[PDB]
Design a protein around this ligand. Structure first.
Ligand SMILES: Nc1ncnc2c1ncn2[C@@H]1O[C@H](COP(=O)(O)OP(=O)(O)OP(=O)(O)O)[C@@H](O)[C@H]1O
Lengths: 370, 101, 98
């Protein structure tokens, strides 16, 4: 009798509690139809959401509600919530308690307004919200350590001790899988092709999801690519065309590793992780080294864990051993963390009752959220 | 709560049961199939009614929303002008007071 | 409509037939109609909940907009007062120079 769902900047997921996978996951997009004449279509709706928006994107104008893990609008956000509850899930919002994710270090005003929208327009019985990173960590069973929540839109290096995140140690970076899509498009253009529309963006992200490579030394990788053409792998098109792929496969995470190729003036992922652990006190640094996880949609690249291991060892003192994990299903680890947290007898104690909102304003509730 | 997989599995069980009862005697299976189809059409009508209710809710939500982005922009520009006037007032206060001393 | 009650009676008599056949399958037949009724009630409750959500959202957006125009009026009045203060202090400085 519980529901859990995400706030992903893209490809948002939703499902019940105590399950191995979300019930339904769909792009987090809302859009309205433009004003025209003869409706050439059947079964039209008010404002299509998610998969319907993807299917009929050519006849819609759409606005993404959540940017870099932070939701800009609120009307679009509640539209998404309505769509999830009443189309994909067919569930009563008044009935079940609901658990919701939360981007690390969000403004108190944003959190409190989000809770009040959850509770007033929906009249939910008892709603709770937790940070995505803690759930992602708990997904791998680990209770302390560093988490590289490198999701779509935003990346967050977050360490955890005592089972809860460290506020002052949290670091933020706006590197994104969408940024990687832009990099892949640019690379494919100087290879020479035509990719400018949103359908072409969809094709590009499909290509990158199907094919990518993470290796150790980009110099020797490029040398091998220019010498031999065996790794020059082919890929289909929706129409009968065949496009062959080279160095861009290795370039897909090179921009992740060194933001200078995109000119972000930031540092690499390994650099950010090392900076975060240095911000951490020297006591639990060995345990944080032993507990390294990669949770996020972008953390699915093949052979990335070993590269992060090499980089952190190189930039770390040699005296202590590291340990980086790579769960088989890292994308949904937030959903699994939410589900396992919900399916706990003691967790029912930390719910936020409707009566509490009735008796007091949500400020003390934002305090209680811990 | 309702679940498509639950509905599909129960439909499969109903098919197996109607197969058994038809093997017993076919007319009972004919009646059971007709009853199955009739509440199937009833639930289809109920689902259509619910979808209509959802469409009503979202349509009226848009109607009540009706813009206000220019409103928020007006909020921003007006408070900016307010703080500008505040700072100018304090600056002139300081300048004139110092000249007076 | 009204066909449903007669259909329920006929299906219960079909249950009588299948339970004079008297197999454990009859218990399954009692269950399938139970979940038919369950999903019917769920559809009705979800419909009413959708209507309630609609009206509640209308109320919330209306109250938010109302306090919005209150803020508009107060801020405009503050702008007018601050402008007046600007001219007043300009004149004060000029008079001090004189
Ligand atoms: N096979 C794949 N390999 C690598 N990356 C992928 C793959 N499939 C999808 N992605 C990336 O994962 C991203 C979305 O992942 P996910 O939904 O887990 O994170 P998110 O919740 O959107 O991020 P955030 O929480 O920061 O908003 C997409 O931007 C996409 O580029």
């Amino acid at each position: 009798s519980a529901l859990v769902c995400d706030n992903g900047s893209g490809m948002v997921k939703a499902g019940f509690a105590g399950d191995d996978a979300p019930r339904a996951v769909f792009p987090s997009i809302v859009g309205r139809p433009r004003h025209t004449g003869v409706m050439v279509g059947m079964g039209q709706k008010d404002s299509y959401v998610g998969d319907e928006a993807q299917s009929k994107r050519g006849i819609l104008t759409l606005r993404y509600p959540i940017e870099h893990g932070i939701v800009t609008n609120w009307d679009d956000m509640e539209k998404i919530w309505h769509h999830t509850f009443f189309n994909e899930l067919r569930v009563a919002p008044e009935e079940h308690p609901v658990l919701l994710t939360e981007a690390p270090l969000n403004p108190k005003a944003n959190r409190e307004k989000m809770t009040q929208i959850m509770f007033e327009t929906f009249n939910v019985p008892a709603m709770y919200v937790a940070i995505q990173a803690v759930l992602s960590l708990y997904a791998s069973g680990r209770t302390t350590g560093i988490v590289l929540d490198s999701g779509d839109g935003v990346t967050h290096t977050v360490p955890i001790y005592e089972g809860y995140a460290l506020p002052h140690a949290i670091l933020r970076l706006d590197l994104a899988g969408r940024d990687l899509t832009d990099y892949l498009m640019k690379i494919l253009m100087e290879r020479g092709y035509s990719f400018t529309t949103t359908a072409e963006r969809e094709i590009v992200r499909d290509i990158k999801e199907k094919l990518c490579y993470v290796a150790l030394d980009f110099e020797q990788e490029m040398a091998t690519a220019l010498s031999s053409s065996a790794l020059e792998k082919t890929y289909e098109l929706p129409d009968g065309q065949m496009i062959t792929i080279g160095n861009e496969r290795f370039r897909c995470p090179e921009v992740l590793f060194n933001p200078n190729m995109i000119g972000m003036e930031a540092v690499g992922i390994h650099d950010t992780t090392f900076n975060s652990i240095m911000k951490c006190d020297v006591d639990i640094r060995k345990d944080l080294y032993n507990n390294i996880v990669l949770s996020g949609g972008t953390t699915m690249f093949p052979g990335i864990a070993d590269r992060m291991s090499k980089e952190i060892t190189a930039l770390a003192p040699s005296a202590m051993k590291i340990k980086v994990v790579a769960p088989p299903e890292r994308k949904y680890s937030v959903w699994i963390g939410g589900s396992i947290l919900a399916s706990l007898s003691t967790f029912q104690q930390m719910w936020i009752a409707k009566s509490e909102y009735d008796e007091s304003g949500p400020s003390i509730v934002h305090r209680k959220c811990f | 709560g309702i679940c498509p997989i639950r509905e599909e599995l129960y439909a499969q069980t109903f098919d197996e049961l109607i197969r058994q009862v038809t093997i017993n005697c076919a007319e009972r299976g004919l009646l059971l199939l007709r009853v199955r189809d009739e509440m199937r059409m009833t639930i289809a009508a109920y689902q259509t009614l619910y979808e209509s209710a959802v469409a009503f809710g979202i349509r009226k939500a848009l109607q009540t929303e009706q813009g206000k982005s220019e409103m928020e922009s007006r909020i921003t520009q007006l408070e900016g002008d307010v703080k500008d006037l505040e700072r100018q007032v304090q600056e002139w206060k300081f300048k004139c007071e110092a000249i007076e001393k």
